[model samples]
Target chain A: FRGYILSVQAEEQYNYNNSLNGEVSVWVYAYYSDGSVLVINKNSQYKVGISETFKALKPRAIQIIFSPSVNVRTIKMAKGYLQRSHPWEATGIKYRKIKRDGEIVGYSHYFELPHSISLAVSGVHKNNVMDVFQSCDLALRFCNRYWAELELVNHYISPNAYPYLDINNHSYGVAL
Target chain B: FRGYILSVQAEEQYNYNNSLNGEVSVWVYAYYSDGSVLVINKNSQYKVGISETFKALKPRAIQIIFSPSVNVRTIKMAKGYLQRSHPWEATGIKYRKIKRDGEIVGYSHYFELPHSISLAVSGVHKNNVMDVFQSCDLALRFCNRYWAELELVNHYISPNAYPYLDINNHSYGVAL
Candidate 1:
């Protein structure tokens, strides 16, 4: 069994709506109990869910996951990204899983990718990739255009091609 | 069951692997057995799915639950949002639903409303009030924003509030 560790943090303010702000910034870190870190200081775009590559080693559990920071104004800006971009529209965007020494702690309720088939289709059709990516880049300083490309291919090209080019693979060339 | 006729005009385009624009615009329409006519024309946003509020009268066998609509561009935006906002971060948002409708459609991702919920707890949330006004605007404009607002409020606010505030009630706060 593989285990993972996760941590999350956000700024604090009264009567503040994250979406109302231009963007919300979130930091995520993941590691193994053996001190082998999987991800660190990964800035998340507002309301959008990011994921680390799956590690091949089957560890027993996640070593750590914590969010011990805040920036009210920055968080507000990040929220602006959320409202304007509506990250929830993206595909494969889903909840964060916390693991403590390989045990599952709790999950966040914001947004995440679908675990099943039917849900996945619905998610892709409803969410617009460009909006999600553009908004995400505002806060995180990085973006993934591949997902959006995949959606375009699926919508306009062929729905069957989406899974073949998901995050796990990086080949963008399609056989015309 | 109350029914209305809708006419839509849209420009449809298709893109192949090498060609970004391969399709053409066309007109489409559908007429229900009961005489409700839905006409779609050129230059209108395509109707991707059924209305979320639709339901069958007798057997309830077939129903249409409205989900948000997305254009090619918006779909890309959604994908971008997911990449920026990884669901585990505090800024990450997600959603889920119970098994009520026979066929469930639409995205499941959502944002946590700690701030928004707090506003609701304090009677400061604007969705409840603004959504009613927005819905009427939608009925006339047939615009995407109005529909989006309606869905947002429907998901976040109490469901019963929808019909009461719309035009059918004939109870505008001010006397005519």
Candidate 2:
């Protein structure tokens, strides 16, 4: 809980015609004064119905499914130091609960990260594909580079280990 | 439900230091076979928390609040025809309801528009400021032009009617 942000990265893909849909992903690397690292990677999908007046075509409910991937390790750094690293800590993520008249009506997950990263990708149907990819690339590069500068043993990203986004697997239609 | 996309536009803004945050806006202008137009302008804000493991600083719940704005009008067109217009129809919009094991757990509003538009802005922290604004401007421009071509009376956007985005009113920090 005492960690602050050290680096951030994000990526997005989109297509527009009538039925709107898109995907966004982010990576955040933080550190403690002790030099321990906390790496958090989050991927979120945003979808909605077109005409809100339509009843049969209701919007899909929100869900936060954590990837069962978590890692903690001690590695040697080229900086002549030992560093502890935690990657993709996804357990605390949840669907924000909602109640109206004390009755449940809605749930959402937004603006829940370091400010700049969250704000960068908050609105739906607001960002285009290139914008998303470029910003995400910058963040990821910054973070990856930060980790490398620490010279953590075997913490290198393969040349082909990037661009793992689902750019071409998207479909389209009305909200229904 | 029978309407197809006549035009689409999206805009996004982002700041990335540690506490990531951003905004997105969209404008969709559609037409019915009778030359009637349905212009929907949806502006959504996305925010999220940093650590998922924290208990006290829980993620905020999701909510959908419709703007108190809706407009329907009739105007004589330069095309020697009368046109009907409906602007910002925000009634059907809602907070998606979620359930886990038949118990409510989440609610979401995603991928509910025409395919391309929805896909454009689905992911969080996925897009940058320029991408969002440019795409949105393009969509708005396209729709506005479409409406003008039909000669809708008094439906013209003033030269200063653009770039109304709040690029300055934003904050940042760790997702505490």
Candidate 3:
């Protein structure tokens, strides 16, 4: 994260709650990341199971960056845009993914495009998984009025695009 | 975000890619977190429609934190854990979600468990959409072993879990 940070040598200061169980989330965000990535170390799994006497602390420096969903500007704007464009009396828009039983059901959508399914088939939607009901021309017009937000994957997925990243002046090796 | 941060005017310095298309991947990450959720802004779709003239820089703050995956410690550790315990070398765990055909395919592991049935019913997978082998015991054991990465979904489905999150918060509220 692009924030001025502080550190406690004890490390123990970061200890999280033991209440975490079953499945849990690890929200990731940068207060103001123009484009910085947070990476989890591959060696971390090994860090756990080793005998507590493995000796030294896991030194696996966890780069602290928990910019919540509301904190990020891109996502914030999109929520606004979707709300304004919706057909229903836009009470609000949902931005995360939904899954059930064992599969993803649907995704976030602020408004329903009142156009033809052909838009997605014609490539007007282009890279989008959903089609733009309004023609590309009209779609641009819509996003223009609302602030609009980009998914960013917004969370975990990368290397599939923009494959290279540089941090601390060294190539971090992966996009994530 | 609880960190030291200052600056107002200079904030204008961070500008992003003009090349972004209709489909994009947002990789939100909360480094070393025990329970956190990452969601995309439903309005993000509008970004593709904006025209260059839309504003005085749109002042659209992207909340940076692209954080593709791999560089952080939480996810990597989980990936490693997922791999070693997998039915087939784990196919080495794909931390990043796969997007194609106008849709996001796989999000973080946690997001997947609730949507369908096949994912977790097979194994505890613990630290995952489902727990692991001996399951509850194994799940705890492995989490104990690797400090495993537990997807907070853990994987995006909500309303059934925490109902007060404001429909959107509960829906978009849960990470996809």
The candidate maximizing TM-score is 1
In the range A36-127, model 2's lDDT, one tens digit per residue, is 33334444333111101101111111112111111101100110000011111222233233333342222223222221011111123322
User: Model 2, stretches more than 4 Å misplaced?
Assistant: A1-62, A68-176, B1-26, B31-33, B45-176
lDDT by residue for model 1 (B1-176), tens:
12222212121211131131221111111222333322222211221211112112211111111221222222211111221233222211222211223322221222211110000000000004354333223332121212232342344223422111211212111110
Give the per-residue lDDT digits (tens) of candidate 3, residues A13-62. Answer: 22321111111112212211223322321111100100000112111111
Among all windows of 10 consecutive residues in model 1 chain B, the one with the lowest summed lDDT is B116-125
As for TM-score, the candidate ahead, 1 or 2, is 1
What's the best-to-worst order under lDDT? 1, 2, 3
lDDT of 1 at B100: 23
Measured with C-alpha atoms, the lDDT of residue A21 in candidate 1 is 29
Ranking by TM-score: 1, 2, 3
**lDDT at A54 for candidate 3?**
12
DockQ of candidate model 3: 0.01
Error of 3 at B85 (Å): 37
DockQ of each model against the real complex?
Answer: 0.01, 0.01, 0.01
